[PDB]
Amino acid sequence: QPSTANGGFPSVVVTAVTATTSISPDIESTWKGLLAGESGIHALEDEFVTKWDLAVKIGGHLKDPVDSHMGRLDMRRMSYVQRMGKLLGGQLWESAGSPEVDPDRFAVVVGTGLGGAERIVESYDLMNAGGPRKVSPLAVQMIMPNGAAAVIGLQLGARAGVMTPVSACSSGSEAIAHAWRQIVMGDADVAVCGGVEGPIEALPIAAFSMMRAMSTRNDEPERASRPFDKDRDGFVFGEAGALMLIETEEHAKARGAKPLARLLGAGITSDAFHMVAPAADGVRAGRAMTRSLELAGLSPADIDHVNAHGTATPIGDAAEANAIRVAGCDQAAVYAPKSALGHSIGAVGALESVLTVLTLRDGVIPPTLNYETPDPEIDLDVVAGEPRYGDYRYAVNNSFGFGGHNVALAFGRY
Amino acid sequence: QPSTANGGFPSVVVTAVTATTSISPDIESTWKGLLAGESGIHALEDEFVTKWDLAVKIGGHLKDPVDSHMGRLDMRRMSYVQRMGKLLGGQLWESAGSPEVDPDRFAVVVGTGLGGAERIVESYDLMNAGGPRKVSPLAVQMIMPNGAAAVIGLQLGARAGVMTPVSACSSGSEAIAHAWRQIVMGDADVAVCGGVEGPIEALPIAAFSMMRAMSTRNDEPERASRPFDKDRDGFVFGEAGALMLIETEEHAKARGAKPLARLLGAGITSDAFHMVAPAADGVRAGRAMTRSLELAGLSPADIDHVNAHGTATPIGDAAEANAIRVAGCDQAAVYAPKSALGHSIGAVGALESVLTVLTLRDGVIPPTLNYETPDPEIDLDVVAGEPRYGDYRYAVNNSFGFGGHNVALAFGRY
Ligand SMILES: CCCCCS(=O)(=O)Nc1ccc2[nH]c(C#N)c(C)c2c1
Ligand SMILES: CCCCCS(=O)(=O)Nc1ccc2[nH]c(C#N)c(C)c2c1
Ligand code: NA
Ligand code: NA
């Protein structure tokens, strides 16, 4: 059956990446900080933590706020994720040399966890106060969850499809998966793909912490996100947004673009087990990893690196450990970037995909922070202490979102 | 290049359909009503129209409300679209004979326009009143827009992927498109696909009517939705939710299922022109129709029927008329079901896909209501007056949502 290795699918490569994180607005500066063991998780100086006395007092805001780049009109015309999307879309295109592509062969796939939710309550108040004629004619285009992808496609002139997949923590990775499908199926030759997500606020914290899914180690904020560690106690919020430019290898050579890595395959499965909790056996999540290898043309032996979902919840890490074993990749070097960057829901899958690309390019994996006592039930070779330089040829990025959505992206060194 | 006609793609057929509309909760009763010229659009006895003195006083609520089938627990555990999804998912499976499929080969793709938006403001109030511990642990799984698809996949046991595409009015059609992709790419053999959407309320009416996109013919509610008519003045809301069961032809023969029609191809393009308005030249929208024919293996001559997007806005119908001309399908018989069923955003593309399947099965197209004075600039052969019985071999369903999202589904008579 067709595969990228046997020529069944056209070769797709990553040619540009961009991300804003709790470490830095510059993806290369974030990469450097991760290698130095830096963490973006700190104590929250926000007034809503003292106002509600939240159980969670830790999390990482963006190092460079999005609205510090937004004028009066952008604060008027777009939602937050649309503002983040326009900012990241412009940085990505300039970083790629601002090429002139065929719009009819240019697609955009940007995932998100919720959408323009804050614009719902704004138009909600604007009518309760003054009536229906006080809701802006731009309200519809601000609230629609496809708005971020629509803003990016309109800004860059993408006419081969503008899509927005929704799947909680796997939204960002699934967007890259569908952009890869849009190319190998012949519907496009170049695609901007990634994920955006809103900022940290009181209601997201309350909703997720009521599931006992978040960490409560407020005394040491940098030490709280402990994926695969035995003293973990949930995940930590870490604001992020990431986009990458993918295109066929022949499209990259024709415009003189230096590819950063290869996008080899993508697998999408589902648990059908629980509305928020992952399946303990990790069979379907591991099947997503296997599916990405089949479309790539690889076997579990070729996988040298696994960028794990690793949220640091007790049940999540244990389920992924079984998933990696089911996929036969338990000999690979594992990295859990949420140990330093936290969880950004709809954008984290895209961010960790960029980190996977940077790992293959530089042949180095940053250390998983706070991994000090290995969980006995979780026996995996995770990188810790200091960066591990290695000959990493192929890597798989995992993203298992709430609702049982499993997405695995197979990446290869260029 | 691979196609369904030349064996490049496996043959996919529709084996079961289900929908709740403003006409009837039974899809066959809705089909009968459409053929008799019935309309689901009436005057709104809702108190919010008199409360805000809305410019729009027309629209069609569901003939059978969703919550009339929902007990105390369902009103506690799920959002509206999740409640609609669970209801439609159960009706679809029973209508298909309740088969036992391989869960690892069973996928679900359900689109929606917004998600569990009303659960945001509920948890918003529940914390303002009593604090963070008053938000339910089920709040996360109710608000996530992937919730409707997640509820259906968990109810039916779909483990080959649960996806939720967001693209406004094309969400329902795009879901069927990705489910067709999930099958022909080998990731699944059977898929439940469709769209769900929330009910008519004051804020959706105010937001869309501020764009001058809705009809104001409140004196004659049944006469207001006039797609391709010269006295049209916007669209009319019509609540709906629809799901269909698609599977490979060999999967349908192995379980003794009578196919209703064939799903032959799907094309997804984007305008990249305006945040809400369609491109006047209709080039990209028509390209989506052409793309569905290429994947199907057909040419514009084979298209006997076009289930038009036809919202009855002045700019929308004119843009689609150019799109049909660009695709070379302007000789086909056109049907605009929004003339009788209205617009249901994220669900209407799925509903009109079911109507396309029923048209090919019964060889008849219902009359486009209120089409009495053809627009001079719009010269197309639309069905009107009474149902037109014909030898319809192939049909294309159009869905051009806000944001420039164009999806065309190519269907063939079985
Ligand atoms: C770092 C991860 C935080 C989770 C965010 S989220 O999962 O809850 N989704 C979401 C989407 C859009 C949003 N806009 C606003 C405003 N203002 C908020 C709070 C917001 C949240
Ligand atoms: C018939 C078409 C109407 C448009 C609906 S919509 O496009 O505005 N999307 C949406 C999604 C979920 C919702 N839940 C609730 C409640 N309660 C509402 C009002 C709602 C609306
Ligand atoms: Na990962
Ligand atoms: Na249609």
Side-chain angles (χ1 to χ4, degrees), chain A residues 146 158-159 161-162 164 166 181-182 185 187 270-271 284 291 405, chain B residues 146 158-159 161-162 164 166 181-182 185 187 270-271 284 291 405:
Chain A
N146 46 305
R159 303 196 162 91
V162 172
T164 302
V166 172
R181 293 185 177 185
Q182 191 82 343
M185 288 195 65
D187 289 72
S270 53
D271 288 348
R284 298 313 299 160
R291 182 51 175 168
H405 309 98
Chain B
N146 46 305
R159 303 196 162 91
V162 172
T164 302
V166 172
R181 293 185 177 185
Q182 191 82 343
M185 288 195 65
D187 289 72
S270 53
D271 288 348
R284 298 313 299 160
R291 182 51 175 168
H405 309 98

PDB file of all heavy atoms in Angstrom, chain A residues 146 158-159 161-162 164 166 181-182 185 187 270-271 284 291 405, chain B residues 146 158-159 161-162 164 166 181-182 185 187 270-271 284 291 405:
ATOM      1  N   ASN A 146     -13.544  28.816  13.441  1.00  0.00           N
ATOM      2  CA  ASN A 146     -12.740  28.864  12.227  1.00  0.00           C
ATOM      3  C   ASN A 146     -12.134  30.237  11.976  1.00  0.00           C
ATOM      4  O   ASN A 146     -11.475  30.421  10.946  1.00  0.00           O
ATOM      5  CB  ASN A 146     -13.592  28.453  11.023  1.00  0.00           C
ATOM      6  CG  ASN A 146     -14.948  29.131  11.015  1.00  0.00           C
ATOM      7  OD1 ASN A 146     -15.697  29.051  11.988  1.00  0.00           O
ATOM      8  ND2 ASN A 146     -15.266  29.812   9.922  1.00  0.00           N
ATOM      9  N   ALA A 158      -4.483  31.980   1.026  1.00  0.00           N
ATOM     10  CA  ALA A 158      -4.568  30.535   0.856  1.00  0.00           C
ATOM     11  C   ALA A 158      -5.939  30.176   0.299  1.00  0.00           C
ATOM     12  O   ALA A 158      -6.964  30.450   0.934  1.00  0.00           O
ATOM     13  CB  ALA A 158      -4.321  29.816   2.182  1.00  0.00           C
ATOM     14  N   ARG A 159      -5.958  29.558  -0.881  1.00  0.00           N
ATOM     15  CA  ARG A 159      -7.204  29.252  -1.567  1.00  0.00           C
ATOM     16  C   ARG A 159      -7.407  27.767  -1.834  1.00  0.00           C
ATOM     17  O   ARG A 159      -8.407  27.399  -2.461  1.00  0.00           O
ATOM     18  CB  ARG A 159      -7.285  30.032  -2.886  1.00  0.00           C
ATOM     19  CG  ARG A 159      -7.173  31.536  -2.698  1.00  0.00           C
ATOM     20  CD  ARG A 159      -7.632  32.304  -3.924  1.00  0.00           C
ATOM     21  NE  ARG A 159      -7.914  33.700  -3.603  1.00  0.00           N
ATOM     22  CZ  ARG A 159      -7.023  34.684  -3.691  1.00  0.00           C
ATOM     23  NH1 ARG A 159      -5.786  34.425  -4.093  1.00  0.00           N
ATOM     24  NH2 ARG A 159      -7.367  35.924  -3.377  1.00  0.00           N
ATOM     25  N   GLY A 161      -7.958  25.584   0.544  1.00  0.00           N
ATOM     26  CA  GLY A 161      -8.585  25.013   1.736  1.00  0.00           C
ATOM     27  C   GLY A 161      -8.125  25.708   3.003  1.00  0.00           C
ATOM     28  O   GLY A 161      -6.936  25.917   3.240  1.00  0.00           O
ATOM     29  N   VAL A 162      -9.099  26.078   3.831  1.00  0.00           N
ATOM     30  CA  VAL A 162      -8.855  26.651   5.151  1.00  0.00           C
ATOM     31  C   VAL A 162      -9.692  25.847   6.138  1.00  0.00           C
ATOM     32  O   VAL A 162     -10.925  25.948   6.136  1.00  0.00           O
ATOM     33  CB  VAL A 162      -9.205  28.143   5.218  1.00  0.00           C
ATOM     34  CG1 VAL A 162      -9.127  28.645   6.651  1.00  0.00           C
ATOM     35  CG2 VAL A 162      -8.271  28.948   4.323  1.00  0.00           C
ATOM     36  N   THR A 164     -10.241  23.972  10.188  1.00  0.00           N
ATOM     37  CA  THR A 164     -10.028  24.111  11.629  1.00  0.00           C
ATOM     38  C   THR A 164     -10.480  22.841  12.332  1.00  0.00           C
ATOM     39  O   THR A 164     -11.688  22.646  12.553  1.00  0.00           O
ATOM     40  CB  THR A 164     -10.772  25.316  12.188  1.00  0.00           C
ATOM     41  OG1 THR A 164     -10.345  26.505  11.510  1.00  0.00           O
ATOM     42  CG2 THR A 164     -10.503  25.457  13.682  1.00  0.00           C
ATOM     43  N   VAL A 166     -10.982  20.467  15.622  1.00  0.00           N
ATOM     44  CA  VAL A 166     -11.194  20.636  17.049  1.00  0.00           C
ATOM     45  C   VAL A 166     -11.050  19.283  17.716  1.00  0.00           C
ATOM     46  O   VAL A 166     -11.822  18.361  17.439  1.00  0.00           O
ATOM     47  CB  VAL A 166     -12.561  21.245  17.368  1.00  0.00           C
ATOM     48  CG1 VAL A 166     -12.763  21.198  18.866  1.00  0.00           C
ATOM     49  CG2 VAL A 166     -12.610  22.674  16.838  1.00  0.00           C
ATOM     50  N   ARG A 181      -2.351  15.497   4.830  1.00  0.00           N
ATOM     51  CA  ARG A 181      -3.289  14.789   3.962  1.00  0.00           C
ATOM     52  C   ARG A 181      -3.667  15.635   2.755  1.00  0.00           C
ATOM     53  O   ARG A 181      -3.767  15.120   1.635  1.00  0.00           O
ATOM     54  CB  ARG A 181      -4.543  14.401   4.742  1.00  0.00           C
ATOM     55  CG  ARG A 181      -4.333  13.366   5.829  1.00  0.00           C
ATOM     56  CD  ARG A 181      -5.668  12.968   6.439  1.00  0.00           C
ATOM     57  NE  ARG A 181      -5.533  11.925   7.451  1.00  0.00           N
ATOM     58  CZ  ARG A 181      -6.561  11.339   8.054  1.00  0.00           C
ATOM     59  NH1 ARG A 181      -7.801  11.695   7.747  1.00  0.00           N
ATOM     60  NH2 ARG A 181      -6.352  10.399   8.965  1.00  0.00           N
ATOM     61  N   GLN A 182      -3.891  16.935   2.966  1.00  0.00           N
ATOM     62  CA  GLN A 182      -4.289  17.816   1.874  1.00  0.00           C
ATOM     63  C   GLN A 182      -3.225  17.881   0.785  1.00  0.00           C
ATOM     64  O   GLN A 182      -3.543  18.147  -0.379  1.00  0.00           O
ATOM     65  CB  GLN A 182      -4.584  19.216   2.418  1.00  0.00           C
ATOM     66  CG  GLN A 182      -5.259  20.158   1.429  1.00  0.00           C
ATOM     67  CD  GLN A 182      -6.763  19.955   1.354  1.00  0.00           C
ATOM     68  OE1 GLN A 182      -7.289  18.931   1.790  1.00  0.00           O
ATOM     69  NE2 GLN A 182      -7.463  20.938   0.799  1.00  0.00           N
ATOM     70  N   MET A 185      -2.752  14.025  -0.996  1.00  0.00           N
ATOM     71  CA  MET A 185      -3.919  13.723  -1.813  1.00  0.00           C
ATOM     72  C   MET A 185      -4.010  14.602  -3.052  1.00  0.00           C
ATOM     73  O   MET A 185      -4.930  14.420  -3.856  1.00  0.00           O
ATOM     74  CB  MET A 185      -5.200  13.859  -0.984  1.00  0.00           C
ATOM     75  CG  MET A 185      -5.402  12.749   0.035  1.00  0.00           C
ATOM     76  SD  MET A 185      -7.086  12.680   0.677  1.00  0.00           S
ATOM     77  CE  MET A 185      -8.000  12.232  -0.796  1.00  0.00           C
ATOM     78  N   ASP A 187      -4.443  17.973  -3.258  1.00  0.00           N
ATOM     79  CA  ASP A 187      -5.249  19.184  -3.174  1.00  0.00           C
ATOM     80  C   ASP A 187      -4.419  20.439  -2.938  1.00  0.00           C
ATOM     81  O   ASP A 187      -4.946  21.545  -3.097  1.00  0.00           O
ATOM     82  CB  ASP A 187      -6.296  19.043  -2.068  1.00  0.00           C
ATOM     83  CG  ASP A 187      -7.395  18.063  -2.429  1.00  0.00           C
ATOM     84  OD1 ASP A 187      -7.122  16.844  -2.448  1.00  0.00           O
ATOM     85  OD2 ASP A 187      -8.528  18.512  -2.698  1.00  0.00           O
ATOM     86  N   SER A 270      -9.009   6.976  17.885  1.00  0.00           N
ATOM     87  CA  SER A 270      -9.791   7.443  19.019  1.00  0.00           C
ATOM     88  C   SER A 270      -9.980   6.305  20.012  1.00  0.00           C
ATOM     89  O   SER A 270      -9.980   5.129  19.640  1.00  0.00           O
ATOM     90  CB  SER A 270     -11.151   8.007  18.581  1.00  0.00           C
ATOM     91  OG  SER A 270     -11.867   7.085  17.780  1.00  0.00           O
ATOM     92  N   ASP A 271     -10.133   6.671  21.286  1.00  0.00           N
ATOM     93  CA  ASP A 271     -10.261   5.671  22.340  1.00  0.00           C
ATOM     94  C   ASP A 271     -11.672   5.100  22.408  1.00  0.00           C
ATOM     95  O   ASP A 271     -11.849   3.881  22.507  1.00  0.00           O
ATOM     96  CB  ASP A 271      -9.874   6.272  23.694  1.00  0.00           C
ATOM     97  CG  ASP A 271      -8.383   6.502  23.830  1.00  0.00           C
ATOM     98  OD1 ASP A 271      -7.618   5.989  22.988  1.00  0.00           O
ATOM     99  OD2 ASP A 271      -7.977   7.201  24.783  1.00  0.00           O
ATOM    100  N   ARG A 284      -5.345   2.136  21.539  1.00  0.00           N
ATOM    101  CA  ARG A 284      -5.717   3.015  20.434  1.00  0.00           C
ATOM    102  C   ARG A 284      -4.721   4.157  20.272  1.00  0.00           C
ATOM    103  O   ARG A 284      -4.404   4.555  19.146  1.00  0.00           O
ATOM    104  CB  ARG A 284      -7.131   3.554  20.646  1.00  0.00           C
ATOM    105  CG  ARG A 284      -8.202   2.472  20.686  1.00  0.00           C
ATOM    106  CD  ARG A 284      -8.034   1.494  19.533  1.00  0.00           C
ATOM    107  NE  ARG A 284      -8.167   2.151  18.237  1.00  0.00           N
ATOM    108  CZ  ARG A 284      -7.711   1.649  17.093  1.00  0.00           C
ATOM    109  NH1 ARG A 284      -7.086   0.478  17.084  1.00  0.00           N
ATOM    110  NH2 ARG A 284      -7.877   2.317  15.960  1.00  0.00           N
ATOM    111  N   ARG A 291       0.070   3.735  13.067  1.00  0.00           N
ATOM    112  CA  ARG A 291      -0.507   4.207  11.811  1.00  0.00           C
ATOM    113  C   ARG A 291       0.392   5.239  11.140  1.00  0.00           C
ATOM    114  O   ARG A 291       0.517   5.257   9.909  1.00  0.00           O
ATOM    115  CB  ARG A 291      -1.900   4.784  12.062  1.00  0.00           C
ATOM    116  CG  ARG A 291      -2.614   5.257  10.807  1.00  0.00           C
ATOM    117  CD  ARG A 291      -2.607   4.184   9.729  1.00  0.00           C
ATOM    118  NE  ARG A 291      -3.381   4.585   8.559  1.00  0.00           N
ATOM    119  CZ  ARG A 291      -3.360   3.946   7.394  1.00  0.00           C
ATOM    120  NH1 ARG A 291      -2.600   2.870   7.240  1.00  0.00           N
ATOM    121  NH2 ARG A 291      -4.097   4.382   6.382  1.00  0.00           N
ATOM    122  N   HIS A 405      -8.901  11.622  21.718  1.00  0.00           N
ATOM    123  CA  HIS A 405      -8.399  11.937  20.384  1.00  0.00           C
ATOM    124  C   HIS A 405      -6.888  11.726  20.356  1.00  0.00           C
ATOM    125  O   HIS A 405      -6.140  12.452  21.019  1.00  0.00           O
ATOM    126  CB  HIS A 405      -8.768  13.368  20.002  1.00  0.00           C
ATOM    127  CG  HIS A 405     -10.220  13.676  20.181  1.00  0.00           C
ATOM    128  ND1 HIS A 405     -10.712  14.330  21.289  1.00  0.00           N
ATOM    129  CD2 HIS A 405     -11.291  13.403  19.399  1.00  0.00           C
ATOM    130  CE1 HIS A 405     -12.022  14.452  21.180  1.00  0.00           C
ATOM    131  NE2 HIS A 405     -12.399  13.900  20.040  1.00  0.00           N
TER     132      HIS A 405
ATOM    133  N   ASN B 146     -15.537  19.630  20.261  1.00  0.00           N
ATOM    134  CA  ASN B 146     -15.470  18.221  19.896  1.00  0.00           C
ATOM    135  C   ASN B 146     -16.399  17.351  20.731  1.00  0.00           C
ATOM    136  O   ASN B 146     -16.392  16.128  20.556  1.00  0.00           O
ATOM    137  CB  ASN B 146     -14.032  17.716  20.037  1.00  0.00           C
ATOM    138  CG  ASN B 146     -13.390  18.153  21.339  1.00  0.00           C
ATOM    139  OD1 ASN B 146     -13.351  19.342  21.653  1.00  0.00           O
ATOM    140  ND2 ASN B 146     -12.894  17.194  22.109  1.00  0.00           N
ATOM    141  N   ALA B 158     -16.684   4.099  18.331  1.00  0.00           N
ATOM    142  CA  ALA B 158     -15.861   4.392  17.164  1.00  0.00           C
ATOM    143  C   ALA B 158     -14.430   4.658  17.613  1.00  0.00           C
ATOM    144  O   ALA B 158     -14.180   5.593  18.382  1.00  0.00           O
ATOM    145  CB  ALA B 158     -16.416   5.590  16.394  1.00  0.00           C
ATOM    146  N   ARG B 159     -13.494   3.842  17.130  1.00  0.00           N
ATOM    147  CA  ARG B 159     -12.107   3.927  17.560  1.00  0.00           C
ATOM    148  C   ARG B 159     -11.131   4.204  16.425  1.00  0.00           C
ATOM    149  O   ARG B 159      -9.919   4.241  16.669  1.00  0.00           O
ATOM    150  CB  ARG B 159     -11.702   2.640  18.291  1.00  0.00           C
ATOM    151  CG  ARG B 159     -12.581   2.335  19.493  1.00  0.00           C
ATOM    152  CD  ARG B 159     -11.954   1.305  20.416  1.00  0.00           C
ATOM    153  NE  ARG B 159     -12.578   1.324  21.736  1.00  0.00           N
ATOM    154  CZ  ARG B 159     -13.613   0.566  22.086  1.00  0.00           C
ATOM    155  NH1 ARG B 159     -14.145  -0.277  21.211  1.00  0.00           N
ATOM    156  NH2 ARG B 159     -14.117   0.650  23.309  1.00  0.00           N
ATOM    157  N   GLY B 161     -11.011   7.060  14.829  1.00  0.00           N
ATOM    158  CA  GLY B 161     -10.948   8.512  14.659  1.00  0.00           C
ATOM    159  C   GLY B 161     -12.276   9.175  14.967  1.00  0.00           C
ATOM    160  O   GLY B 161     -13.337   8.765  14.496  1.00  0.00           O
ATOM    161  N   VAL B 162     -12.210  10.223  15.784  1.00  0.00           N
ATOM    162  CA  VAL B 162     -13.359  11.064  16.103  1.00  0.00           C
ATOM    163  C   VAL B 162     -12.929  12.504  15.855  1.00  0.00           C
ATOM    164  O   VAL B 162     -12.109  13.048  16.604  1.00  0.00           O
ATOM    165  CB  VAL B 162     -13.843  10.874  17.547  1.00  0.00           C
ATOM    166  CG1 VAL B 162     -14.902  11.907  17.894  1.00  0.00           C
ATOM    167  CG2 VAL B 162     -14.390   9.466  17.742  1.00  0.00           C
ATOM    168  N   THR B 164     -13.855  16.684  14.477  1.00  0.00           N
ATOM    169  CA  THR B 164     -14.846  17.759  14.446  1.00  0.00           C
ATOM    170  C   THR B 164     -14.317  18.910  13.604  1.00  0.00           C
ATOM    171  O   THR B 164     -13.497  19.711  14.086  1.00  0.00           O
ATOM    172  CB  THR B 164     -15.184  18.246  15.849  1.00  0.00           C
ATOM    173  OG1 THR B 164     -15.671  17.151  16.636  1.00  0.00           O
ATOM    174  CG2 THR B 164     -16.244  19.340  15.788  1.00  0.00           C
ATOM    175  N   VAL B 166     -14.634  22.563  11.799  1.00  0.00           N
ATOM    176  CA  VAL B 166     -15.333  23.818  12.022  1.00  0.00           C
ATOM    177  C   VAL B 166     -15.165  24.684  10.790  1.00  0.00           C
ATOM    178  O   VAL B 166     -14.045  25.061  10.436  1.00  0.00           O
ATOM    179  CB  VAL B 166     -14.827  24.555  13.264  1.00  0.00           C
ATOM    180  CG1 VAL B 166     -15.470  25.923  13.298  1.00  0.00           C
ATOM    181  CG2 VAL B 166     -15.170  23.739  14.506  1.00  0.00           C
ATOM    182  N   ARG B 181     -12.574  10.829   3.214  1.00  0.00           N
ATOM    183  CA  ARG B 181     -11.119  10.728   3.144  1.00  0.00           C
ATOM    184  C   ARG B 181     -10.595   9.655   4.088  1.00  0.00           C
ATOM    185  O   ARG B 181      -9.682   8.900   3.734  1.00  0.00           O
ATOM    186  CB  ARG B 181     -10.477  12.074   3.475  1.00  0.00           C
ATOM    187  CG  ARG B 181     -10.730  13.176   2.464  1.00  0.00           C
ATOM    188  CD  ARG B 181      -9.936  14.418   2.834  1.00  0.00           C
ATOM    189  NE  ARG B 181     -10.091  15.493   1.860  1.00  0.00           N
ATOM    190  CZ  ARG B 181      -9.422  16.640   1.907  1.00  0.00           C
ATOM    191  NH1 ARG B 181      -8.550  16.859   2.881  1.00  0.00           N
ATOM    192  NH2 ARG B 181      -9.623  17.567   0.980  1.00  0.00           N
ATOM    193  N   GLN B 182     -11.155   9.581   5.298  1.00  0.00           N
ATOM    194  CA  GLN B 182     -10.697   8.604   6.280  1.00  0.00           C
ATOM    195  C   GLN B 182     -10.887   7.176   5.787  1.00  0.00           C
ATOM    196  O   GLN B 182     -10.161   6.270   6.209  1.00  0.00           O
ATOM    197  CB  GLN B 182     -11.433   8.816   7.605  1.00  0.00           C
ATOM    198  CG  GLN B 182     -10.863   8.039   8.785  1.00  0.00           C
ATOM    199  CD  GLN B 182      -9.672   8.730   9.426  1.00  0.00           C
ATOM    200  OE1 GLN B 182      -9.061   9.622   8.837  1.00  0.00           O
ATOM    201  NE2 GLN B 182      -9.338   8.319  10.645  1.00  0.00           N
ATOM    202  N   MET B 185      -8.469   6.513   2.326  1.00  0.00           N
ATOM    203  CA  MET B 185      -7.068   6.450   2.720  1.00  0.00           C
ATOM    204  C   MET B 185      -6.745   5.208   3.537  1.00  0.00           C
ATOM    205  O   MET B 185      -5.581   5.008   3.899  1.00  0.00           O
ATOM    206  CB  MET B 185      -6.678   7.705   3.506  1.00  0.00           C
ATOM    207  CG  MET B 185      -6.570   8.962   2.655  1.00  0.00           C
ATOM    208  SD  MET B 185      -5.700  10.304   3.490  1.00  0.00           S
ATOM    209  CE  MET B 185      -4.056   9.610   3.639  1.00  0.00           C
ATOM    210  N   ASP B 187      -7.896   4.312   6.615  1.00  0.00           N
ATOM    211  CA  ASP B 187      -7.937   4.425   8.066  1.00  0.00           C
ATOM    212  C   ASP B 187      -9.231   3.894   8.670  1.00  0.00           C
ATOM    213  O   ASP B 187      -9.289   3.702   9.889  1.00  0.00           O
ATOM    214  CB  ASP B 187      -7.732   5.882   8.486  1.00  0.00           C
ATOM    215  CG  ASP B 187      -6.310   6.357   8.261  1.00  0.00           C
ATOM    216  OD1 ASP B 187      -5.925   6.548   7.088  1.00  0.00           O
ATOM    217  OD2 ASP B 187      -5.577   6.534   9.257  1.00  0.00           O
ATOM    218  N   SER B 270     -10.972  27.250  -0.677  1.00  0.00           N
ATOM    219  CA  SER B 270     -11.250  28.441   0.111  1.00  0.00           C
ATOM    220  C   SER B 270     -11.124  29.676  -0.769  1.00  0.00           C
ATOM    221  O   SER B 270     -10.377  29.686  -1.750  1.00  0.00           O
ATOM    222  CB  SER B 270     -10.321  28.549   1.329  1.00  0.00           C
ATOM    223  OG  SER B 270      -8.958  28.460   0.957  1.00  0.00           O
ATOM    224  N   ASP B 271     -11.874  30.720  -0.407  1.00  0.00           N
ATOM    225  CA  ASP B 271     -11.887  31.941  -1.205  1.00  0.00           C
ATOM    226  C   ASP B 271     -10.666  32.810  -0.927  1.00  0.00           C
ATOM    227  O   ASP B 271     -10.029  33.310  -1.860  1.00  0.00           O
ATOM    228  CB  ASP B 271     -13.168  32.737  -0.939  1.00  0.00           C
ATOM    229  CG  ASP B 271     -14.396  32.096  -1.552  1.00  0.00           C
ATOM    230  OD1 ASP B 271     -14.241  31.172  -2.377  1.00  0.00           O
ATOM    231  OD2 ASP B 271     -15.519  32.518  -1.203  1.00  0.00           O
ATOM    232  N   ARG B 284     -13.268  29.952  -6.812  1.00  0.00           N
ATOM    233  CA  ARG B 284     -12.819  28.953  -5.846  1.00  0.00           C
ATOM    234  C   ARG B 284     -13.962  28.041  -5.417  1.00  0.00           C
ATOM    235  O   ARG B 284     -13.763  26.836  -5.226  1.00  0.00           O
ATOM    236  CB  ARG B 284     -12.190  29.641  -4.635  1.00  0.00           C
ATOM    237  CG  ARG B 284     -10.957  30.468  -4.969  1.00  0.00           C
ATOM    238  CD  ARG B 284      -9.998  29.688  -5.857  1.00  0.00           C
ATOM    239  NE  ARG B 284      -9.512  28.477  -5.202  1.00  0.00           N
ATOM    240  CZ  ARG B 284      -8.982  27.441  -5.844  1.00  0.00           C
ATOM    241  NH1 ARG B 284      -8.873  27.463  -7.166  1.00  0.00           N
ATOM    242  NH2 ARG B 284      -8.566  26.380  -5.166  1.00  0.00           N
ATOM    243  N   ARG B 291     -13.249  19.864  -8.186  1.00  0.00           N
ATOM    244  CA  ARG B 291     -12.387  18.945  -7.449  1.00  0.00           C
ATOM    245  C   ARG B 291     -13.136  17.679  -7.049  1.00  0.00           C
ATOM    246  O   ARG B 291     -12.569  16.580  -7.072  1.00  0.00           O
ATOM    247  CB  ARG B 291     -11.811  19.645  -6.218  1.00  0.00           C
ATOM    248  CG  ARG B 291     -10.853  18.790  -5.406  1.00  0.00           C
ATOM    249  CD  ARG B 291      -9.779  18.174  -6.288  1.00  0.00           C
ATOM    250  NE  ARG B 291      -8.790  17.438  -5.506  1.00  0.00           N
ATOM    251  CZ  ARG B 291      -7.880  16.623  -6.029  1.00  0.00           C
ATOM    252  NH1 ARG B 291      -7.831  16.434  -7.340  1.00  0.00           N
ATOM    253  NH2 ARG B 291      -7.020  15.993  -5.240  1.00  0.00           N
ATOM    254  N   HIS B 405     -15.272  29.155   3.088  1.00  0.00           N
ATOM    255  CA  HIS B 405     -15.052  27.711   3.114  1.00  0.00           C
ATOM    256  C   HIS B 405     -16.001  27.045   2.122  1.00  0.00           C
ATOM    257  O   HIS B 405     -17.221  27.056   2.315  1.00  0.00           O
ATOM    258  CB  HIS B 405     -15.252  27.169   4.526  1.00  0.00           C
ATOM    259  CG  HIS B 405     -14.472  27.910   5.564  1.00  0.00           C
ATOM    260  ND1 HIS B 405     -15.027  28.893   6.354  1.00  0.00           N
ATOM    261  CD2 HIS B 405     -13.171  27.824   5.929  1.00  0.00           C
ATOM    262  CE1 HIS B 405     -14.104  29.376   7.165  1.00  0.00           C
ATOM    263  NE2 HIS B 405     -12.969  28.743   6.930  1.00  0.00           N
TER     264      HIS B 405
END
